[PDB]
Amino acid sequence: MYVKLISSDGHEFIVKREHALTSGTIKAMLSGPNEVNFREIPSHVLSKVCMYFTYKVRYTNSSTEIPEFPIAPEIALELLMAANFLD
């Protein structure tokens, strides 16, 4: 029931469809003609992507405040590029 997110380092991140399908393009893909390949995104970037997916779904029904999600300065550039494949 999870979507497998493949990093460019060969590491496999297993994220639930509920956990992944929290943004647009990730809903736009697959929902038609799981597995998603990020050939440009190393595992030290895609890990934060996958952990952010889990963060998004777990707080999709929150009350008032939403915690901050720290990002390392060396991966934000590639997370933005990953975001353009997921958001």
Binding site: Y52, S63, L77, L80, A82, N84, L86, D87
Partner: protein, 279 residues
């Protein structure tokens, strides 16, 4: 005139901070207005056009000051229009604050996304500052469901009838500030306890009213509520930490962002929209 009251609010030291001015320096006026004008943010007139319900000048300026907006608080915007306040208040509360907007029409929210993308792509001040990207939902702002929560700083972006003001008064947590143009009377509503309230006038304004519920014998009434209380997207998360990374470095190196962002080992087609405002 109403200038004496506005001055009394400033002289009372209710604002104190410069965060409000920072939002005006960071966000470019007019980049939330309709493409047919892109000018009314600089003029005092009727700002309502099509489905756009913003009023960047004195009207929204006093709203930004009316809310103390301590960083980190949760902001609720009913009548978000194109996101003018939701972005600039999100800037005042911090790029990673909570900013949940709702508006009546999907055309202006659809446009709001066009304006947020257009601002990041082609604005002038983007490459200098951190920004918060607000969230939107579409629905009738007067139909508040039992799934609503509590917020710290709350604003209504459209006219409210006095008989229905409670639809948002109930949403304010103790110690927060609620601002609403109630029948074009813009007021500062404060909760000082469990059942103790205080209010002050802000400004005489002109808003388009919210569409009063008229549905019966169905499940429209009180079934809209507030926007989903959810974590924002990854482009804004990364984009903010990209701006923090560079801004935090230059804060020490100064002891131009457009040129620095050109050397990041990222292609220009991405940097041109993501960082460089196409130079």
């Amino acid at each position: 005139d109403n200038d004496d009251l506005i001055d009394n609010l400033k002289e009372a030291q209710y604002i104190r901070t410069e965060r409000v001015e920072q939002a005006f320096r960071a966000i470019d006026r007019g980049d939330y207005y309709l493409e047919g004008y892109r000018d009314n943010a600089y003029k005092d007139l009727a700002w309502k056009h099509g489905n756009i319900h913003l009023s960047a000048p004195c009207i929204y300026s006093e709203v930004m000051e009316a809310l103390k907006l301590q960083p980190g608080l949760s902001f609720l915007n009913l009548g978000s229009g194109t996101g003018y306040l939701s972005t600039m208040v999100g800037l005042i509360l911090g790029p990673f604050g909570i900013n949940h907007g709702i508006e009546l029409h999907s055309d202006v929210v659809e446009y709001a996304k066009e304006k947020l993308e257009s601002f990041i792509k082609n604005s002038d001040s983007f490459d200098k500052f951190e920004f918060c990207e607000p969230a939107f939902v579409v629905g009738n702002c007067l139909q508040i469901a039992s799934d609503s929560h509590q917020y710290d700083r709350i604003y209504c972006g459209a006219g409210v009838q006095k008989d229905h003001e409670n639809y948002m008064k109930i949403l304010l947590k103790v110690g927060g500030i609620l601002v609403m143009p109630i029948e074009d009377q813009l007021t500062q509503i404060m909760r000082t306890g469990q059942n103790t309230w205080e209010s002050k006038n802000i400004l005489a304004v002109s808003f388009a009213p919210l569409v009063q519920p008229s549905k019966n014998d169905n499940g429209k009434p009180d079934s809209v509520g507030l926007p989903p209380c959810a974590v924002r997207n990854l482009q804004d998360l990364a984009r903010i930490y990209i701006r923090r990374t560079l801004r935090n470095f230059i804060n020490d190196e100064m002891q131009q962002n457009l040129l620095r962002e050109k050397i990041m080992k990222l292609p220009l087609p991405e940097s041109l929209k993501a960082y460089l405002t196409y130079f």
